[PDB]
Amino acid sequence: SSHHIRLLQQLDEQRQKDLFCDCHIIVEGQMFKAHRNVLFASSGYFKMLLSQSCRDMGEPITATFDVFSADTFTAILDFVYSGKLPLSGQNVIEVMSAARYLQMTDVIGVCKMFIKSSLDIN
Amino acid sequence: SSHHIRLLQQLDEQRQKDLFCDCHIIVEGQMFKAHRNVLFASSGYFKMLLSQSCRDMGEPITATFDVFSADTFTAILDFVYSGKLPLSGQNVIEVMSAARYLQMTDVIGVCKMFIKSSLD
């Protein structure tokens, strides 16, 4: 497990430092840099978007979204690169909606668990 | 950390299917396809090799090695993509030597533990 945790920490450092970042995502005018292989692995949407050029290298692939906010995409991509998803009642509905759009069943599951846990109040 | 396990399983499937493989490694006449970002994260040798072009895309980077065998590199790359290193009494010293060349301290440690526990 330590192998997997260290490796993903390194990939997270790489995307923060723009190393090997062959995918650009623009949300609300904000630019996110990331790796195609990680996104393809993590998202049914990116599997559909990136499949055509999966054996081509050259320009980075630039994808634009206006169906969710930059803050919401930050939370999703932070999870992709860490496995942690900070949620509150203020953002879990938006994150879950974006996870449906990006077809990320694991993020959807984390959101539903958070909602169920959060509602048990009394 | 089930996210971490699934993610690396997917990356392993990708390199087996030659998806997003921007690095080619030729060892003993045999071609290995892999990802630069994973290799840069996993090996001090590959970190140095791939640093020059880490923001340049285009041709895959091709590396060649003659200081270890294809079977030995298979074991190391399988570990890179799974966390499991297939060691035996036959190959443990060959794997350790390649891991020193590739500057992979985690693989060196696993080899030393294999030898140390061989008396148990």
Chain centroid to Cα A47, Å, comes to: 13
- Phi and psi at residue B105, to the nearest 5°: -65, -30
β-strand pairing of A23-27 with B61-65? unpaired
Are the CB atoms for A8 and A82 separated by under 8 Å? yes
Structural domains in chain B, sorted by start: 2-117 (3.30.710.10)
Q: Which residues 83-102 in chain A show a CB within 8 A of chain B?
A: 83
Are the CB atoms for A21 and A61 separated by under 8 Å? no
| Cα B47 to Cα A11, A92, B38, B39, B119, distances in angstroms | 13, 38, 10, 7, 35
How many whole angstroms separate alpha carbon B60 and alpha carbon B24?
Answer: 7
Could you tell me the two tokens for A33? 């840099």
* Deposited experimental method: X-ray
- Phi and psi at residue A73, to the nearest 5°: -65, -35
| Cα A106 to Cα A35, A96, B19, B90, distances in angstroms | 19, 10, 22, 41
Chain centroid to Cα B4, Å, comes to: 18
Determine the residue among A37, A57, A84, A103 to mutate to test chain B binding: the one whose Cβ has the most chain B Cβ atoms within 10 Å: A37
How many whole angstroms separate alpha carbon A18 and alpha carbon B54?
Answer: 9
Please write down the HEC assignment for all residues of B8-53.
Answer: HHHHHHHHHCCCCCCEEEEECCEEEEECHHHHHHHCHHHHHHHHCC
SS3 A26: strand
Using alpha carbons, select from B68, B81, B71, B66 the residue that is nearest to residue B34.
B81
Using alpha carbons, select from A73, A100, A80 the residue that is nearest to residue A12.
A80
Query: Which class for B76: exposed (0-12), middle (13-18), buried (19 or more C-beta within 10 A)?
Result: buried
Could you tell me the two tokens for B47? 């970190």
Using alpha carbons, select from A94, A51, A54, A57 the residue that is nearest to residue A74.
A94
CB contact under 8 A, B54 and A19: yes
Q: Which residue has the tokens 């148990």?
A: B120
Contacts of A79 in chain B (CB under 8 A): 3
Are the CB atoms for A115 and A90 separated by under 8 Å? no
Using alpha carbons, select from A19, A36, A33 the residue that is nearest to residue B40.
A19
B44 touches chain A (CB under 8 A): no
Using alpha carbons, select from A50, A54, A44, A102 the residue that is nearest to residue A75.
A102
Could you tell me the two tokens for B1? 């950390």
Given A22, A37, A54, which is nearest B11 (Cβ)?
A: A37
A55 touches chain B (CB under 8 A): yes
How many whole angstroms separate alpha carbon A21 and alpha carbon B55?
Answer: 7
- Edge to edge, the sheet with strand A61-65 lists A30-34, A23-27, A61-65
Given B4, B20, B41, which is nearest A54 (Cβ)?
A: B20
SS3 A24: strand
